[PDB]
């Protein structure tokens, strides 16, 4: 139930409000619709392409030391 967000400076922040442990004063399936499943597919494709070895010809990748070339380039 804990939704965490990692920051580039090592900071880990809890996302949104913290819900109680299912205790409310008392005295179906959480399925995804069309756009949610499409966003799931798109984020999946992104996580695929965002791999470092797949980060070909991008400024965000670091090149191999003593080589001056990105890892997919050397590959």
């Amino acid at each position: 139930q804990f939704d965490l967000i990692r920051l580039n400076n090592g900071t880990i922040e809890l996302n949104g409000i913290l819900t109680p442990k299912a205790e409310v004063l008392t005295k179906i399936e959480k399925t995804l619709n069309i756009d949610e499943l499409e966003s799931v597919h798109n984020t999946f494709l992104t996580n695929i392409l965002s791999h470092k070895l797949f980060a070909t010809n991008t400024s965000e990748i670091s090149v191999g030391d003593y080589s001056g070339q990105p890892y997919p380039t050397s590959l």
């Binding site: 409000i17 109680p20 442990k21 299912a22 205790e23 409310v24 004063l25």
Partner: protein, 126 residues
């Protein structure tokens, strides 16, 4: 002052802030991301809040309203029903009798103890 005592009863029993004319002595921001700062309008006060007892009473009422708002925000409920605890607070009818009498203090202490009970229960069990 019927309207003002109604608004004060709402603030002390639900933490609901609705002052479109800036006549109530308590308002906050976000009308730090989760924490809003409450500001006490000194011009529209009901007392001088200069003595330690008056300051503590004002702090207690403000804390009661803040705890009510926090409980409403956490439970995602628009209002808090009276059955949430064994404590009930009646609405104020005569403002002068409430001022000269300690029934105001009775109501304040009762709703403060109620809010403390509810908050402690929700945090110790929820």
């Amino acid at each position: 002052s019927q309207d003002y005592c109604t608004m004060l009863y709402e603030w002390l029993t639900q933490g609901i802030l609705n002052d479109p004319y800036q006549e109530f002595m308590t308002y906050d921001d976000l009308e730090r991301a989760w924490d809003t700062q409450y500001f006490i309008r000194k011009d529209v006060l009901l007392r001088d809040c200069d003595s330690e007892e008056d300051k503590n009473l004002l702090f207690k009422m403000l804390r009661t309203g803040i705890l009510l708002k926090v409980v409403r925000a956490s439970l995602q409920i628009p209002t808090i029903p009276s059955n949430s605890s064994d404590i009930t607070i009646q609405e104020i009818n005569d403002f002068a009798d409430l001022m000269e009498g300690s029934n105001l203090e009775l109501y304040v202490d009762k709703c403060y103890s109620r809010a403390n009970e509810i908050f402690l229960k929700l945090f110790f069990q929820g």
